[PDB]
A = this chain, B = another copy of it.
Amino acid sequence: GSGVGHSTGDYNNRTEFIYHGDEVTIICHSTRLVHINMSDREDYIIYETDRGPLFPTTQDLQGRDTLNDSYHAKVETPWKLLHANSWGCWFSPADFQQMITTCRDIAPIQMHQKIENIVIKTVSKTGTGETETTNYNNDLTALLQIAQDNSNLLPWAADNFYIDSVGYVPWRACKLPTYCYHVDTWNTIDINQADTPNQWREIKKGIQWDNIQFTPLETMINIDLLRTGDAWQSGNYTFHTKPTNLAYHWQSQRHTGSCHPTVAPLVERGQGTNIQSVNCWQWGDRNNPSSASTRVSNIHIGYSFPEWQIHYSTGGPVINPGSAFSQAPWGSTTEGTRLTQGASEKAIYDWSHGDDQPGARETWWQNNQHATGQTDWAPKNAHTSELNNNVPAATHFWKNSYHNTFSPFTAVDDHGPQYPWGAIWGKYPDTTHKPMMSAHAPFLLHGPPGQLFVKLAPNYTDTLDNGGITHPRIVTYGTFWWSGKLVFKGKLRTPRQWNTYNLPSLDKRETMKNTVPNEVGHFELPYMPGRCLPNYTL
């Protein structure tokens, strides 16, 4: 039957691996209990923000300190945003290890999700003083309102870049972030000035009101009102995208192609000698020496970029990313000297997302340490005027430059999936030129999965006056159960080598006992890269 006293759903959180020849189908189930409470206000608001912490108020650091600007302007809505976009939502640590061990590449296929077992109740404080008593009792007639945005009419806020998502741990309750989106504002800081150098000045700062766009959800999309006995279905969503490679590439531009002819060593621990005179294609007008350094090739692996590039835009300063690569060949190590140069990134996360203790935030800095073939770091490169049998002069050689060598010839490679905290998918901008590849999320989508908004309908007291001054409402909160199923498909991996692999494990910075629960139940999900095993590029 159906009604107040019948449950509308069940709890399924588990994964399935379906193997058929050269094909893997992964079916991820996720079910979470979501704790929601009444909105801070029933109105939309639009407000400017302060600069932020550590933004310079003085000229003493002469502009180098202005990277700290968080200033912006938003429209905050009463709605809460619920998305599953992250790897740690769908997979357990052992499930993700199973995937990245046994698969070559993978892509998401289809997704649907549900909301059910809706409970709403009110708080009544009769304590009337010290030793106060509160009562939590059901409102059987009360509304949870749900809006799925399928056509993507609303601005896109679910990118998982603030790591605000449904929790990673299945047996813990979750809370949603409030939905809000930017409005048009000019923030322009001038750190390079003609008249007065070593200064910074703001030219245009403020909200641009003339063309401003304000979109409520009420006008754009249909909203479903639900009571305690009814439930909600998403419908089916089908991804259209390309698989992402689960193998890291170690080969640089000198690890590919036919290797230079050599004379093999006669003894043990002896080294071969490069034959001096060989048939070769050389760059430039050069036969002597004909070396592996200069020889033609069809492609180039990696490109230099000015890094870290700080783009001062109309909205404020940003980072323009370079390509992902490991600084390990140059002597970088997590402990000791850290070289951030590889388009490295850090995650900040709390107890709700893969963190050990409550009330604190933990940081994981990922240097991308397995990708060593792509590493191109501009201060280390050089260029010379003539390439020939002569060695260049002091002039006609330029050591220290920073340039962008991205060209038609460059083959490059992205970050790939990052467990737990990485976003699974992202959204293309609509522009005449779409980006060629993503800087974080492995999958860029034209239509991304529709954004799902959740709100408690207001329960007013009897005193609402229609004049606007008094609209009290009784304190209300709710809980519902969110279920979802995401399907992946990929290619089966088989050994390409004689010797054994290093199968995906735990980063040296992690130990196994911190992964499992504690005496008080505290544990943290380990980091794993989506690409833990090598393969040949070309």
Interface assignment of A496: CB less than 8 Å from any CB of chain B: no
What is the 8 Å Cβ interface bit string for chain A, positions 193-232, against chain B (1 contact, 0 not)?
Answer: 0000000000000011111101010111111111111100
Asked if B43 and A162 sit within 8 Å, CB to CB, the answer is: no
Interface assignment of A171: CB less than 8 Å from any CB of chain B: yes
Asked if A467 and B251 sit within 8 Å, CB to CB, the answer is: no
Instruction: Point out the residues of chain B lying under 8 angstroms from A226, CB to CB.
Output: 7
Interface assignment of A279: CB less than 8 Å from any CB of chain B: yes
Which listed residue (B45, B117, B158) contacts A258, Cβ 8 A?
B158
The size bracket of the interface on A is 35 or more
Instruction: Point out the residues of chain B lying under 8 angstroms from A50, CB to CB.
Output: 271-274
Asked if A308 and B293 sit within 8 Å, CB to CB, the answer is: no
Known A-B contacts A4-B4, A287-B348; the reply to A518 vs B127 at CB < 8 A is: no
Known A-B contacts A170-B219, A262-B74; the reply to A6 vs B227 at CB < 8 A is: yes
Q: How far is the CB of A200 from chain B (nearest CB, A)?
A: 14
Secondary structure dominating the interface of A:
loop
Instruction: Point out the residues of chain B lying under 8 angstroms from A211, CB to CB.
Output: 250, 512
Chain B binder among A311-319, A485-493, A526-534: A311-319
What is the 8 Å Cβ interface bit string for chain A, positions 483-518, against chain B (1 contact, 0 not)?
Answer: 000000000000000000000000000011100111
Asked if A278 and B348 sit within 8 Å, CB to CB, the answer is: yes
Interface assignment of A368: CB less than 8 Å from any CB of chain B: no
Interface assignment of A57: CB less than 8 Å from any CB of chain B: no
What are 6 A-B contacts defined by CB distance under 8 Å? A161-B281, A175-B464, A177-B258, A253-B313, A270-B519, A285-B340
Interface assignment of A156: CB less than 8 Å from any CB of chain B: yes
Asked if A259 and B181 sit within 8 Å, CB to CB, the answer is: yes
Instruction: Point out the residues of chain B lying under 8 angstroms from A7, CB to CB.
Output: 143, 225-227, 230
Chain B binder among A33-41, A235-243, A378-386, A402-410: A33-41
Known A-B contacts A174-B466, A211-B250, A255-B184; the reply to A361 vs B293 at CB < 8 A is: no
Interface assignment of A284: CB less than 8 Å from any CB of chain B: yes
In the complex, the chain B residue whose C-beta lies closest to that of A276 is B53
Asked if B316 and A216 sit within 8 Å, CB to CB, the answer is: no
Instruction: Point out the residues of chain B lying under 8 angstroms from A175, CB to CB.
Output: 464-466
B-facing residues in A30-63 (Cβ within 8 Å): 33, 35, 37, 40-50, 52-54
Interface assignment of A291: CB less than 8 Å from any CB of chain B: yes
Instruction: Point out the residues of chain B lying under 8 angstroms from A481, CB to CB.
Output: 225
Which listed residue (B43, B253, B469) contacts A315, Cβ 8 A?
B253
Which listed residue (B272, B350, B458) contacts A48, Cβ 8 A?
B272
Q: In the complex, which of the residues A5, A313, A319, A431 has the most CB atoms of chain B within 10 Å of its own CB atom?
A: A5
Asked if A35 and B464 sit within 8 Å, CB to CB, the answer is: yes
Instruction: Point out the residues of chain B lying under 8 angstroms from A279, CB to CB.
Output: 162-164, 348-350, 353, 361
In the complex, the chain B residue whose C-beta lies closest to that of A249 is B431
In the complex, the chain B residue whose C-beta lies closest to that of A278 is B162
Interface assignment of A180: CB less than 8 Å from any CB of chain B: yes
Asked if B256 and A13 sit within 8 Å, CB to CB, the answer is: no
Asked if A467 and B351 sit within 8 Å, CB to CB, the answer is: yes
Known A-B contacts A48-B271, A125-B133; the reply to A42 vs B308 at CB < 8 A is: no
Known A-B contacts A359-B468, A464-B173; the reply to A291 vs B222 at CB < 8 A is: no
What is the 8 Å Cβ interface bit string for chain A, positions 121-143, against chain B (1 contact, 0 not)?
Answer: 01111111101011111111111
Q: How far is the CB of A69 from chain B (nearest CB, A)?
A: 5
Asked if A293 and B318 sit within 8 Å, CB to CB, the answer is: yes
Instruction: Point out the residues of chain B lying under 8 angstroms from A187, CB to CB.
Output: 254
Chain B binder among A100-108, A392-400, A470-478: A470-478
